[PDB]
Curated annotation (Swiss-Prot), chain B:
It holds the Pfam family p450. Ubiquitously expressed with highest levels in testis, ovary, adrenal, prostate, liver, kidney and lung. Ubiquitinated by MARCHF6, leading to proteasomal degradation. Its cofactor is heme. It comes from the Eukaryota. It comes from Homo sapiens. Its EC number is 1.14.14.154. Sterol 14alpha-demethylase that plays a critical role in the cholesterol biosynthesis pathway, being cholesterol the major sterol component in mammalian membranes as well as a precursor for bile acid and steroid hormone synthesis. This is Lanosterol 14-alpha demethylase. It catalyses: a 14alpha-methyl steroid + 3 reduced [NADPH--hemoprotein reductase] + 3 O2 = a Delta(14) steroid + formate + 3 oxidized [NADPH--hemoprotein reductase] + 4 H2O + 4 H(+); lanosterol + 3 reduced [NADPH--hemoprotein reductase] + 3 O2 = 4,4-dimethyl-5alpha-cholesta-8,14,24-trien-3beta-ol + formate + 3 oxidized [NADPH--hemoprotein reductase] + 4 H2O + 4 H(+); 24,25-dihydrolanosterol + 3 reduced [NADPH--hemoprotein reductase] + 3 O2 = 4,4-dimethyl-8,14-cholestadien-3beta-ol + formate + 3 oxidized [NADPH--hemoprotein reductase] + 4 H2O + 4 H(+); a 14alpha-methyl steroid + reduced [NADPH--hemoprotein reductase] + O2 = a 14alpha-hydroxymethyl steroid + oxidized [NADPH--hemoprotein reductase] + H2O + H(+). Keywords: Cholesterol biosynthesis, Cholesterol metabolism, Endoplasmic reticulum, Heme, Iron, Lipid biosynthesis, Lipid metabolism, Membrane, Metal-binding, Microsome, Monooxygenase, Oxidoreductase, Steroid biosynthesis, Steroid metabolism, Sterol biosynthesis, Sterol metabolism, Transmembrane, Transmembrane helix, Ubl conjugation. Belongs to the cytochrome P450 family. One of its GO terms (cellular component) is membrane.
Length: 444, 445
């Protein structure tokens, strides 16, 4: 019985809050060098054990929620946003069943509807950008993906309900994913806290309309919303309008920022490497045809450089930078015993550029997978959508959304850095955004 | 006409204060990577331009004080501590004459007196350490250096006055060297300013009577104090007691924490590398004889290995991390022009560790000066004592003090890391101290 190596700190309560908050990746890498794959440190009165590399990460991924708990650590910020009865407000096994319902709605038949739907929105959004200029790509992508995600994961009913003042209510909901919502108790009246809670009530209320609007129309519509309204537990109990609305919010959030971010980054990687940008466009012609017809799901499967470009963007910029659990029981990894109380953590980001197992780690090189790599060489070195019980379900949909958008975007425009500026990473938010994400764009 | 590359910060007033504050060398080397030898950034509403590498630092080192001025940047810290009419409170030509006088005291005749003074102080101090144990070297060293530096630089009369009270007065003065004193206006009253001011008066008062008393006795004492009492500007004008008192405070502050931090680090470099440590002890025997007799200045010149260990310590841990100037007129380096108003900096630490010119840069290797190295291969790669008009005058004394101390310390003890711990650097203060500088020791064979 032995404790993970502990990283002592000068500052009594803050701990490593300032060094880690400043640049978590450098911090975690420096710690990996000095202390190894399993270590502890204190931030803001809380102790964190991190698991780095595949072997160590294995513990968090392979474990039961009974032993490494996700609600204990997420409820604080998620439950106020998504709502009661949904996600981390219920016991895990109840959650899994809701996960299976959402899974059902994410299949090839729906994805075939999604492709053309997203393609139209993309084309129609970018009518405002004209033939050339300099605009913020991430904000454009943020707005577009709020349109595409809603169109696909919510109904046409809800998509037709989106205006300026609804995006504001979504923005209010984003402000729930904060530094402060995690650390500070909910009973404090902060600006962001009231802002968020106001929007939750409103948007639940807006979803109540559209659920009622569809529950009553007879036209057989087969999208994701229908899948939810039709589903049932092992019980045989259908979902309450509340439950449904709860998981509609969870879909909107999961599906929006994780794809805007990633799309935005890939933009800058492709603008920095103009040869690779050219090859992606060439592959568009080679696969789909020189006449560039509207996109099909079946064509997507064959855009393999684009696919690896997305694989590689997610490698160097996974939007979920950290996974967390609470140790409810003692757990053993690498010979260390993590005591109950620690928040146990894995970082895809660190794992995915770890010097031990990636060649030219900081290089944007989608051909790395066409060689030997730990993404197939190792279990948990490449892990942007997690693994085990808490593993993602949006991977196919996120690949469809991003793929369609960038196909359309490369068809519209050639992209370039402004004065060679490659954006750095903003760590002031759990939304990890590119700093000043403005690209130059020529018509193709 | 082009200004240096500038590093932007989101944070409005503070700018890079946190990123620089936390790890300056890390910050500066990453900046070197992205931007090159010359760049500018801002902290707490001040803009800094750094000159990294021999070629760039040549600007600061070669420049005249009118162009790149030190009073403008040092005075707020310095004058309150040393007092008026001294150092950076007077125009630079006046300071040079002052430096010339101090220099004339730092000669071989006095250094020979110093050796046997310092050795005795060292032997006597470390009697409280006993056969073995675990103690805080850095604390022991600063305590010791206060005694040795006073004895050598102030004289026997002042050293006999050194008690618990006076040690506290000096520590209050040290408190004047805060980042706070550099940033915040002097009419504010933090606890530490009051202390600095009160202690400045009480120390001057002590030095006054000490100066008075020797100006009177007939004992022909040939030391650094007498050199000051007998000195004269080109004028013909001798120093007033307040000037003598000033530079005496200057001397103790100067010759104290520079030697104590450097000695402490060397302790840790020697404890980390045990076969190096033993070779140093063998050198003692090989040079001074097997009997290990009392140290002499002459013997110190032939301790080449210990010399290079100090040289190498100063290379990796120079006590003065940043030298600074105010730009009064515009200056040009590497094609860039620094506007008047920027604070222009060099860091010996960064220069002395630069991938480009240092083979295995982070390695403590005293024998690197027996190969081809940039200390002789370049101009300003190795500059722990500065260069140009503001060049240090204390190097020879520093070496005498540290060699004598560590020579003795090696004869007395063998040193070890506690649990393989090597202290990291404390940056929260201007005395760049080692973290938890406790060392293991046992009586040497
Ligand atoms: O000696 C090296 C160390 O010195 C300085 O640390 C001081 C620090 O600045 C102050 O904060 C204070 O420490 C108090 C601390 O704040 C409290 O948390 C508490 O500490 C207790 C721990 O909570 C508890 O876990 C246990 O500690 C044991 C560890 O659990 C166990 O793993 C092991 O620790 C070893 C580490 O695992 C290993 O990594 C290595 O530690 C290195 C550190 O990681 C590194 O940061 C540095 O530490 C410096 C530090 O920077 C200084 O500021 O080097 C270390 C090399 O040793 O080795 C560890 C063993 O040394 O064992 C420990 C038990 O030894 O108990 C502790 C109480 O002991 O109370 C503290 C009250 O002092 O003071 C410290 C000491 O000067
Ligand atoms: O633009 C004119 C500028 O040109 C020269 O600077 C170049 C520099 O020498 C190159 O090294 C390189 O600099 C890179 C830079 O170091 C990186 O940090 C990065 O910068 C991006 C930021 O990371 C990102 O945050 C954002 O910047 C925004 C700021 O965060 C925000 O505060 C605000 O900027 C305000 C400034 O804070 C404020 O001081 C003021 O700035 C003006 C300067 O004071 C003035 O000297 C001049 O700068 C010259 C510079 O001296 C040349 O050497 O004009 C400045 C701006 O007009 O005014 C701002 C208030 O609006 O807004 C910015 C958004 O711009 O984005 C930046 C830029 O991508 O990227 C750089 C790599 O390209 O390039 C620069 C520029 O060519
Ligand atoms: C690039 C896009 C995406 C990435 C990189 C991503 C990443 C992740 C990661 C890392 C996890 C594991 C979290 C943990 O273990 O703590 C996860 C879980 C999950 N994701 Fe995503 N996601 C993306 C898009 C989506 C989409 C579009 C949806 C909705 C269809 C979604 C819904 C979910 C759900 C329901 C979970 C399960 C949470 C749990 O079981 O505790 N994600 N995702
Ligand atoms: C190892 C110990 C020492 C180191 C590393 C050191 C370092 C330095 C450095 C880097 C400078 C240049 C300052 C600048 O340009 O900003 C300097 C200047 C100076 N030092 Fe030292 N020093 C040491 C010991 C001493 C001692 C013992 C004395 C007095 C006996 C002393 C007195 C001075 C003086 C008078 C200056 C000139 C300041 C000026 O002209 O602006 N130093 N020293
Ligand atoms: C203290 C500290 O150092 N830190 C505070 C906590 N910090 C953190 C916060 C949240 C987090 O996230 C995990 C939870 C919350 O969000 C998702 C991630 N997600 C998003 C899309 N797919 C998955 C999620 C799951 C299902 C659904 Cl329906 C929707 C979503 Cl948003 O899992 C991960 C890390 C890490 C940094
Ligand atoms: C904002 C910022 O980034 N920062 C704050 C200011 N920072 C700084 C502060 C002081 C400094 O110091 C140079 C001046 C001050 O002190 C000496 C150094 N000194 C000591 C011994 N030998 C030389 C000195 C010279 C002669 C005599 Cl008589 C006595 C002394 Cl104390 O020169 C150098 C740098 C640099 C870091």
């Amino acid at each position: 019985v032995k404790s993970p190596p502990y990283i002592f700190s000068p500052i009594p309560f803050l701990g490593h809050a300032i060094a880690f908050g400043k640049s978590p990746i450098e911090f975690l890498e420096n710690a990996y060098e000095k202390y190894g794959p399993v270590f502890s440190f204190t931030m803001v009165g809380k102790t964190f054990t991190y698991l780095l590399g595949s072997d160590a990460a294995a513990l968090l991924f392979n474990s039961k929620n009974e032993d490494l708990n996700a609600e204990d650590v997420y409820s604080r910020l998620t439950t106020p946003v998504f709502g009661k009865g949904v996600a981390y407000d219920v016991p895990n096994p109840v959650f899994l069943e809701q996960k299976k319902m959402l899974k059902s709605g994410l299949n090839i038949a729906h994805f075939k509807q999604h492709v053309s739907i997203i393609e139209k929105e993309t084309k129609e959004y970018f009518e405002s950008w004209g033939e050339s200029g300099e605009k913020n790509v991430f904000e454009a992508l943020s707005e577009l993906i709020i349109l595409t995600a809603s169109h696909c994961l919510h109904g046409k009913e809800i998509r037709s309900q989106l205006n300026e003042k609804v995006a504001q209510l979504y923005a209010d909901l984003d402000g729930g994913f904060s530094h402060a919502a995690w650390l500070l108790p909910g009973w404090l009246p902060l600006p962001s806290f009231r802002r968020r809670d106001r929007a939750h009530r409103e948007i639940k209320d807006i979803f109540y309309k559209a659920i009622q609007k569809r529950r009553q129309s007879q036209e057989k519509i087969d999208d994701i919303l229908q899948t939810l309204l039709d589903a049932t537990y092992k019980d045989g109990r259908p979902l309450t309008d509340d439950e449904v609305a709860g998981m509609l919010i969870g879909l909107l959030l999961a599906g929006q920022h994780t794809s805007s971010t990633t799309s935005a980054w890939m933009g800058f990687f492709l603008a920095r490497d103009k040869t690779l940008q050219k090859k992606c466009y060439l592959e568009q012609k080679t696969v789909c045809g020189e006449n560039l017809p509207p996109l099909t799901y079946d064509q997507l499967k064959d855009l393999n450089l684009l696919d690896r470009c997305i694989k590689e963007t997610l490698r160097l910029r996974p939007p979920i930078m950290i996974m967390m659990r609470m140790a409810r029981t003692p757990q053993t990894v690498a010979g260390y015993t993590i005591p109950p109380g620690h928040q146990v953590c894995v970082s895809p980001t660190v794992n995915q550029r770890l010097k031990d197992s990636w060649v030219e780690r900081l290089d944007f090189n989608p051909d790395r997978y066409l060689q030997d790599n730990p993404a197939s060489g190792e279990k948990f070195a490449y892990v942007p959508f997690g693994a085990g019980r808490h593993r993602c379900i949006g991977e196919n949909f996120a690949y469809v959304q991003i793929k369609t958008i960038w196909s359309t975007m490369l068809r519209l425009y050639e992209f370039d850095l402004i004065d060679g500026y490659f954006p750095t990473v903003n760590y002031t938010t759990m939304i990890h955004t590119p700093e000043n994400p403005v690209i130059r764009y020529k018509r193709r």
